Amino acid sequence: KPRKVWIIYSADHPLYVDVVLKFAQFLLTACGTEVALDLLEEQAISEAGVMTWVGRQKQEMVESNSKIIVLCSRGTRAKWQALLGRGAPVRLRCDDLFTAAMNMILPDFKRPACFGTYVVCYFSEVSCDGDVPDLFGAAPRYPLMDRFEEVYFRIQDLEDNYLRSPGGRQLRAALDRFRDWQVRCPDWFECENLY
């Protein structure tokens, strides 16, 4: 049985969604890791609840000793602030499973035994440390891809080089493309936010 993983993220813009999908594919084609990703299960999410689906993903990871990757970004920051009632609610065009997933995993962060399940990341090219919700507090943060090595170790239970691995250049092209856009359109996030 290959390593399985659940990716949690905020769908901030079609370009960042593509970054996320390319990462998922990199994990599969470069690391032989199976990924639970909401993009890939729209039907299941449709029929079962969104809460039912999120609850089902977490359950499968924890009981199989598999990791939950938290991908942090501009949207995870804003959605967390909203959850805290210290920022307006967010209504993103691409949406909200990140908020649902945050509700689901929340209690785990008063449980030290549960921290090793979570792998807290953000892509340094398009996102920043300040994007990580303080819910994760003292959990290690991995700037990707600078520190993907460490994330790999955790996914594998152990103890720009990825560009030559299958799917690495595609992920990097996706990163570059979103980055250039944030430069071209600095208010990209605010444009994604409806009402």
Numbering used by the authors: 376 to 470, 477 to 540, 556 to 591
Q: What do the authors of the reporting publication say about this deposited model?
A:
A unique intracellular signaling domain termed SEFIR is found within all IL-17 receptors (IL-17Rs) as well as the key adaptor protein Act1. SEFIR-mediated protein–protein interaction is a crucial step in IL-17 cytokine signaling. The IL-17 receptor (IL-17R) family comprises five members (IL-17RA to IL-17RE) with considerable sequence divergence, which are all membrane-bound proteins containing single transmembrane domains. IL-17Rs contain fibronectin type III (FnIII) domains within the extracellular portion and a unique structural motif within the cytoplasmic tails termed the SEFIR [SEF (similar expression to fibroblast growth factor genes) and IL-17R] domain.
Here, we report the crystal structure of a fragment from the IL-17RA intracellular signaling domain including its SEFIR domain and a short C-extension at 2.3 Å resolution. Besides the complete SEFIR domain (residues 376–540) of IL-17RA, the structure reported here additionally includes a short C-terminal extension (residues 556–591) of about 35 amino acids. The structure is well defined except for two flexible loops, the electron densities of which are not observable. One is a six-amino-acid short linker (residues 471–476) within the CC′ loop. The other is a 14-amino-acid linker (residues 541–555) connecting helices αE and αE′. The longer helix αF is sandwiched by two short helices, αE′ and αG, in a Z-shaped crank shape. This predominantly helical C-extension of SEFIR packs tightly against helices αA and CC′ins and loops CC′, DD′ and EE′ through extensive van der Waals interactions, stabilizing the overall architecture. In contrast to the complete disorder in the structure of IL-17RB SEFIR, the unique and long insertion between strand βC and helix αC in the IL-17RA SEFIR structure is mostly well ordered, displaying a helix (αCC′ins) and a flexible loop (CC′). The most striking observation when comparing the two SEFIR structures is the absence of the knot feature in IL-17RA SEFIR. The DD′ loop in IL-17RA SEFIR is much shorter compared with that in IL-17RB SEFIR. Together with the short helix αD, it rotates almost 90° with respect to the IL-17RB SEFIR structure and shifts by more than 12 Å, making sufficient space to accommodate the αCC′ins helix. The results here implicate that the αC helix of IL-17RA is the most critical region within the SEFIR domain for its heterotypic interaction with Act1 and is essential for IL-17A signaling.
